[PDB]
Design a protein around this ligand. Sequence first.
Ligand SMILES: [Zn+2]
Ligand SMILES: [Zn+2]
Ligand SMILES: [Zn+2]
Ligand SMILES: [Zn+2]
Lengths: 153, 153
Amino acid sequence: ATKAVCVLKGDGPVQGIINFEQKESNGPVKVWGSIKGLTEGLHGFHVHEFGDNTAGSTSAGPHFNPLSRKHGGPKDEERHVGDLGNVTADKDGVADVSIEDSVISLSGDHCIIGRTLVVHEKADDLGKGGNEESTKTGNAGSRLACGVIGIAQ
Amino acid sequence: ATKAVCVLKGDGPVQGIINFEQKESNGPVKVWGSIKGLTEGLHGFHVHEFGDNTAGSTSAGPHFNPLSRKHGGPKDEERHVGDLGNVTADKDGVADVSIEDSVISLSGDHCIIGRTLVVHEKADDLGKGGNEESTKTGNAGSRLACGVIGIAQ
Ligand SMILES: [Zn+2]
Ligand SMILES: [Zn+2]
Ligand SMILES: [Zn+2]
Ligand SMILES: [Zn+2]
């Protein structure tokens, strides 16, 4: 029953705390928390490869992708491990994240501990945009906030 | 070579960047970087258990101690895995860090990825202080800056 947690911060108003819980090593990860300061609507939500914040969110590298696959949505078989899809911010700018994913893990080679959670400026097109960028980043625009995923009590 | 990085930050002027490198999974970890904004002299320098920054530095928990030992300095046989002793700040308040350690690791059971690196108000007394707290924290006083230890490129 490992746990992890991530504090999201950036240059702008997006601030949040995201929790991870995985009761069994072979099991689904529950991802939940509140993010505020977001524009209303959809925002791309990814684990990027490096837990490196030295040059801000830009040093976090690309989507966490140990199987060298193409970018998709969390329901797709063809996706990056870090592809968690979108979160939705309400009219007050609050996204109450609630996600369950079976591809990220808190252990083994899909481990995301020590990597960077990023919430994005726009919607992830889940790889359905018809351009090369769609199958790379999902066209979710800029990295509005980020933080390193840490082991939690 | 496994690599890791930590960006140390806090409420005041103390901030810095610490890098970690471990060429061999069963070899020592080299630790180097720079911290500025410090009072001249000795400052405790610890890996704390949790990569949890939700309540600032205080949620980081106690020193990382997977073998349940007593607190000491890094050369001691009786030490926490997280006990990296002290860094030294010059008259300009810059601590140039350059350490090698064989107890911390970037993989496996002693793995510090996803935990919290902390730099402290005062000297770590290396467990030679003579009170209870010496055997736990080293009496290094406040947590001035911290960061989660992240996987680096
Ligand atoms: Zn992204
Ligand atoms: Zn992706
Ligand atoms: Zn400490
Ligand atoms: Zn200790």
